[PDB]
CSV table of N, CA and C and ligand atoms in Angstrom, one decimal:
chain,number,residue,atom,x,y,z
Q,1,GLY,N,0.6,56.9,-19.4
Q,1,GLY,CA,1.1,56.0,-20.5
Q,1,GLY,C,2.4,55.2,-20.0
Q,2,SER,N,2.3,53.9,-20.0
Q,2,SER,CA,3.5,53.1,-19.6
Q,2,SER,C,3.4,51.7,-20.1
Q,3,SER,N,4.5,51.0,-20.3
Q,3,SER,CA,4.5,49.6,-20.8
Q,3,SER,C,4.1,48.7,-19.6
Q,4,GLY,N,4.0,47.4,-19.9
Q,4,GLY,CA,3.7,46.4,-18.8
Q,4,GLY,C,4.1,45.0,-19.2
Q,5,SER,N,3.0,44.2,-19.6
Q,5,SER,CA,3.2,42.8,-20.0
Q,5,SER,C,2.4,42.5,-21.3
Q,6,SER,N,2.5,43.3,-22.3
Q,6,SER,CA,1.7,43.0,-23.5
Q,6,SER,C,2.6,42.5,-24.7
Q,7,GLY,N,2.4,41.3,-25.0
Q,7,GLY,CA,3.2,40.6,-26.1
Q,7,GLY,C,3.2,39.1,-26.0
Q,8,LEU,N,4.4,38.5,-26.2
Q,8,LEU,CA,4.4,37.1,-26.2
Q,8,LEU,C,5.6,36.7,-25.4
Q,9,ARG,N,5.8,35.3,-25.2
Q,9,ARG,CA,6.9,34.8,-24.5
Q,9,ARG,C,8.1,34.7,-25.3
Q,10,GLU,N,8.8,35.8,-25.5
Q,10,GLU,CA,10.0,35.9,-26.3
Q,10,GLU,C,11.3,35.9,-25.4
Q,11,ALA,N,11.9,34.7,-25.1
Q,11,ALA,CA,13.0,34.7,-24.3
Q,11,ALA,C,14.3,34.8,-25.1
Q,12,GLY,N,14.6,33.7,-25.8
Q,12,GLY,CA,15.8,33.8,-26.7
Q,12,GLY,C,16.7,32.5,-26.5
Q,13,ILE,N,16.7,31.6,-27.6
Q,13,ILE,CA,17.5,30.4,-27.5
Q,13,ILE,C,18.9,30.7,-27.9
Q,14,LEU,N,19.9,30.1,-27.2
Q,14,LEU,CA,21.3,30.4,-27.5
Q,14,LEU,C,22.1,29.2,-27.0
Q,15,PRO,N,23.3,29.0,-27.6
Q,15,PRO,CA,24.2,27.9,-27.3
Q,15,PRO,C,24.8,28.0,-25.9
Q,16,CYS,N,25.0,26.9,-25.2
Q,16,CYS,CA,25.6,26.9,-23.9
Q,16,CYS,C,26.9,27.7,-23.8
Q,17,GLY,N,27.0,28.8,-23.2
Q,17,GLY,CA,28.1,29.7,-23.1
Q,17,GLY,C,29.0,29.3,-21.9
Q,18,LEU,N,29.0,28.0,-21.6
Q,18,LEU,CA,29.9,27.6,-20.5
Q,18,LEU,C,30.8,26.4,-21.0
Q,19,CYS,N,30.3,25.5,-21.8
Q,19,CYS,CA,31.1,24.4,-22.3
Q,19,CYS,C,31.4,24.5,-23.8
Q,20,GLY,N,30.4,25.1,-24.5
Q,20,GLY,CA,30.5,25.4,-26.0
Q,20,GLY,C,29.5,24.5,-26.7
Q,21,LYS,N,28.4,24.0,-26.0
Q,21,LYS,CA,27.4,23.1,-26.5
Q,21,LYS,C,26.3,24.0,-27.2
Q,22,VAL,N,25.5,23.4,-28.1
Q,22,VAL,CA,24.4,24.1,-28.8
Q,22,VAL,C,23.1,23.4,-28.5
Q,23,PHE,N,22.1,24.2,-28.2
Q,23,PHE,CA,20.7,23.7,-27.8
Q,23,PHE,C,19.7,24.6,-28.7
Q,24,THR,N,18.5,23.9,-28.9
Q,24,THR,CA,17.5,24.6,-29.6
Q,24,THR,C,16.2,24.7,-28.7
Q,25,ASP,N,16.0,23.7,-27.9
Q,25,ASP,CA,14.9,23.7,-26.9
Q,25,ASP,C,15.2,24.2,-25.5
Q,26,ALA,N,14.5,25.3,-25.2
Q,26,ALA,CA,14.7,26.0,-24.0
Q,26,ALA,C,14.6,25.0,-22.8
Q,27,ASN,N,13.6,24.2,-22.7
Q,27,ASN,CA,13.5,23.1,-21.8
Q,27,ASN,C,14.7,22.2,-21.8
Q,28,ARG,N,15.2,21.8,-22.9
Q,28,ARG,CA,16.4,20.9,-22.9
Q,28,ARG,C,17.6,21.6,-22.4
Q,29,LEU,N,17.7,22.9,-22.8
Q,29,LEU,CA,19.0,23.6,-22.3
Q,29,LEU,C,18.8,23.9,-20.8
Q,30,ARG,N,17.6,23.9,-20.3
Q,30,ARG,CA,17.4,24.2,-18.9
Q,30,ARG,C,18.0,23.1,-18.0
Q,31,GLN,N,17.9,21.9,-18.6
Q,31,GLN,CA,18.4,20.7,-17.8
Q,31,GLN,C,19.9,20.7,-17.8
Q,32,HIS,N,20.5,21.0,-19.0
Q,32,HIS,CA,21.9,21.0,-19.2
Q,32,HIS,C,22.6,22.0,-18.2
Q,33,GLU,N,21.9,23.1,-18.0
Q,33,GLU,CA,22.5,24.1,-17.2
Q,33,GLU,C,22.7,23.6,-15.8
Q,34,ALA,N,21.9,22.7,-15.4
Q,34,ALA,CA,22.0,22.1,-14.1
Q,34,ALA,C,23.4,21.4,-13.9
Q,35,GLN,N,23.8,20.7,-15.0
Q,35,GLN,CA,25.1,20.0,-15.0
Q,35,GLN,C,26.2,21.0,-14.5
Q,36,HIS,N,26.2,22.2,-15.0
Q,36,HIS,CA,27.2,23.1,-14.6
Q,36,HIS,C,26.9,23.8,-13.3
Q,37,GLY,N,25.7,24.1,-13.0
Q,37,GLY,CA,25.3,24.7,-11.8
Q,37,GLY,C,24.9,26.2,-11.8
Q,38,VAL,N,24.3,26.5,-12.9
Q,38,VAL,CA,23.8,27.9,-13.1
Q,38,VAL,C,22.8,28.4,-12.0
Q,39,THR,N,23.4,29.1,-11.1
Q,39,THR,CA,22.6,29.6,-10.0
Q,39,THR,C,21.9,28.6,-9.3
Q,40,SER,N,22.5,27.4,-9.3
Q,40,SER,CA,21.9,26.1,-8.7
Q,40,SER,C,22.9,25.2,-8.2
Q,41,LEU,N,22.6,24.2,-7.4
Q,41,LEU,CA,23.5,23.2,-6.8
Q,41,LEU,C,23.0,21.8,-7.1
Q,42,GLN,N,23.4,21.3,-8.3
Q,42,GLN,CA,22.9,20.0,-8.6
Q,42,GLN,C,23.7,18.9,-8.0
Q,43,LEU,N,23.2,18.1,-7.1
Q,43,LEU,CA,23.9,17.0,-6.5
Q,43,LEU,C,23.2,15.7,-6.7
Q,44,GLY,N,23.8,14.6,-6.1
Q,44,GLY,CA,23.2,13.3,-6.2
Q,44,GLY,C,24.1,12.3,-7.0
Q,45,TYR,N,25.0,13.0,-7.8
Q,45,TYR,CA,26.0,12.2,-8.6
Q,45,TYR,C,27.0,11.5,-7.7
Q,46,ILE,N,27.8,10.6,-8.4
Q,46,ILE,CA,28.9,10.0,-7.6
Q,46,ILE,C,30.2,10.7,-7.8
Q,47,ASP,N,31.0,10.9,-6.7
Q,47,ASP,CA,32.2,11.4,-6.8
Q,47,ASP,C,33.2,11.0,-5.7
Q,48,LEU,N,34.4,10.7,-6.1
Q,48,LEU,CA,35.4,10.2,-5.2
Q,48,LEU,C,36.8,10.8,-5.5
Q,49,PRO,N,37.0,12.0,-5.3
Q,49,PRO,CA,38.2,12.6,-5.5
Q,49,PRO,C,39.4,12.2,-4.5
Q,50,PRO,N,40.6,12.6,-4.8
Q,50,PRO,CA,41.7,12.2,-4.0
Q,50,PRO,C,41.8,13.0,-2.7
Q,51,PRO,N,42.6,12.6,-1.7
Q,51,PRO,CA,42.8,13.2,-0.4
Q,51,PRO,C,43.4,14.6,-0.5
Q,52,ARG,N,43.0,15.4,0.5
Q,52,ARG,CA,43.6,16.8,0.5
Q,52,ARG,C,45.2,16.8,0.4
Q,53,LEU,N,45.7,18.0,0.2
Q,53,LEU,CA,47.2,18.0,0.0
Q,53,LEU,C,47.7,18.8,1.3
Q,54,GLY,N,48.1,18.1,2.3
Q,54,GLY,CA,48.8,18.7,3.5
Q,54,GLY,C,49.7,17.7,4.2
Q,55,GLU,N,50.4,18.3,5.2
Q,55,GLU,CA,51.3,17.5,6.0
Q,55,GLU,C,51.5,18.0,7.4
Q,56,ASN,N,52.2,17.4,8.3
Q,56,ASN,CA,52.5,17.8,9.6
Q,56,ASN,C,53.6,17.2,10.2
Q,57,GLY,N,54.2,17.7,11.3
Q,57,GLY,CA,55.4,17.2,11.9
Q,57,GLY,C,56.6,17.9,11.7
Q,58,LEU,N,56.6,19.2,12.1
Q,58,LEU,CA,57.8,20.1,12.0
Q,58,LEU,C,58.0,20.9,13.3
Q,59,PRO,N,59.2,21.4,13.4
Q,59,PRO,CA,59.6,22.2,14.6
Q,59,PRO,C,59.0,23.5,14.7
Q,60,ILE,N,59.4,24.3,15.6
Q,60,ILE,CA,58.8,25.6,15.8
Q,60,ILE,C,59.8,26.8,15.5
Q,61,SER,N,61.1,26.4,15.6
Q,61,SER,CA,62.2,27.4,15.4
Q,61,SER,C,62.7,27.2,14.0
Q,62,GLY,N,62.7,25.9,13.5
Q,62,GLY,CA,63.2,25.5,12.2
Q,62,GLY,C,64.7,25.3,12.3
Q,63,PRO,N,65.3,25.1,11.0
Q,63,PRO,CA,66.8,24.8,10.9
Q,63,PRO,C,67.5,26.2,11.1
Q,64,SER,N,68.7,26.1,11.6
Q,64,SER,CA,69.6,27.3,11.9
Q,64,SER,C,70.8,27.3,11.0
Q,65,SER,N,70.4,27.5,9.7
Q,65,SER,CA,71.5,27.5,8.7
Q,65,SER,C,71.4,28.8,7.8
Q,66,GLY,N,72.6,29.2,7.4
Q,66,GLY,CA,72.7,30.5,6.7
Q,66,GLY,C,73.9,31.1,6.6
A,101,ZN,ZN1,27.1,23.3,-21.1
């Protein structure tokens, strides 16, 4: 005697626990999850962030003050 796969497709609909949105259709929420990246990497969108934060042009010993 042991269980297996006897029943129905009972998943469970719930509101997006990442941004705070609410969904009713599993298929609809499945797409929204992509926006965040739930175990996936959704790319193709346009992005143009600022340049990295770094600099150069300094000595090796530094200033001798103290
Ligand atoms: Zn969300």
